[PDB]
Amino acid sequence: MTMEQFLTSLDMIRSGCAPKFKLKTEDLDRLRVGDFNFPPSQDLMCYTKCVALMAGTVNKKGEFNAPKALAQLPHLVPPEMMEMSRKSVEACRDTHKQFKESCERVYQTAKCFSENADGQFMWP
């Protein structure tokens, strides 16, 4: 995918997940720019799970599949974002083990991605 297709993909992914939850627009805006520096609601955490499930990077128990994530990357991010994404997958591959609940596992892995992103991070 191109950068242009990626940016638009963010909205398309959000549209298939956001209606399932009660979410604040201001929280979604902050995740969109990689700002995870605020307390999430349960809804917001499960929203992040719905997104990762769509991407095929976690199972229904929210366990992060780092081999599959790396295999999926070309269908998720453009070339310009591959190396940053690969690095973040490696840094955050074990975050899910600290947590037991599925939504929480995904949210904390996403939060780790944002903090280990050596550049601009964007979430659907």
Side-chain angles (χ1 to χ4, degrees), residues 48-81:
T48 68
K49 179 191 178 186
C50 176
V51 169
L53 273 168
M54 187 180 296
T57 62
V58 300
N59 58 22
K60 278 217 141 94
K61 295 281 182 290
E63 288 164 324
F64 184 60
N65 186 349
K68 181 168 182 156
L70 292 171
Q72 281 308 119
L73 282 181
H75 319 280
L76 299 178
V77 301
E80 298 94 315
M81 288 175 65

Side-chain angles (χ1 to χ4, degrees), residues 16-35:
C17 281
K20 296 181 179 196
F21 305 99
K22 180 208 266 215
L23 304 164
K24 308 193 215 76
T25 297
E26 62 261 35
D27 292 356
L28 296 175
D29 289 347
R30 294 188 274 183
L31 301 195
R32 179 54 69 85
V33 302
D35 179 5

Side-chain angles (χ1 to χ4, degrees), residues 1-3 6-7 10 73 76-87 118 120-123:
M1 63 170 69
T2 63
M3 282 295 337
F6 177 72
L7 296 159
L10 304 178
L73 282 181
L76 299 178
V77 301
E80 298 94 315
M81 288 175 65
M82 286 298 290
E83 188 44 29
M84 174 193 75
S85 296
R86 281 193 292 261
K87 280 199 183 75
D118 53 7
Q120 286 178 348
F121 184 72
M122 305 171 217
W123 190 261

Side-chain angles (χ1 to χ4, degrees), residues 36 40 42 44-46 48-50 52 57-65 92-113 123:
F36 283 67
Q42 182 183 215
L44 193 64
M45 294 199 286
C46 295
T48 68
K49 179 191 178 186
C50 176
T57 62
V58 300
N59 58 22
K60 278 217 141 94
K61 295 281 182 290
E63 288 164 324
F64 184 60
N65 186 349
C92 304
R93 73 186 299 151
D94 284 342
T95 306
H96 71 98
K97 289 169 189 174
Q98 287 187 31
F99 307 92
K100 278 133 152 280
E101 194 274 317
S102 65
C103 296
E104 173 98 87
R105 284 172 167 171
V106 184
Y107 173 86
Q108 300 286 342
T109 308
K111 182 179 173 78
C112 181
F113 288 162
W123 190 261

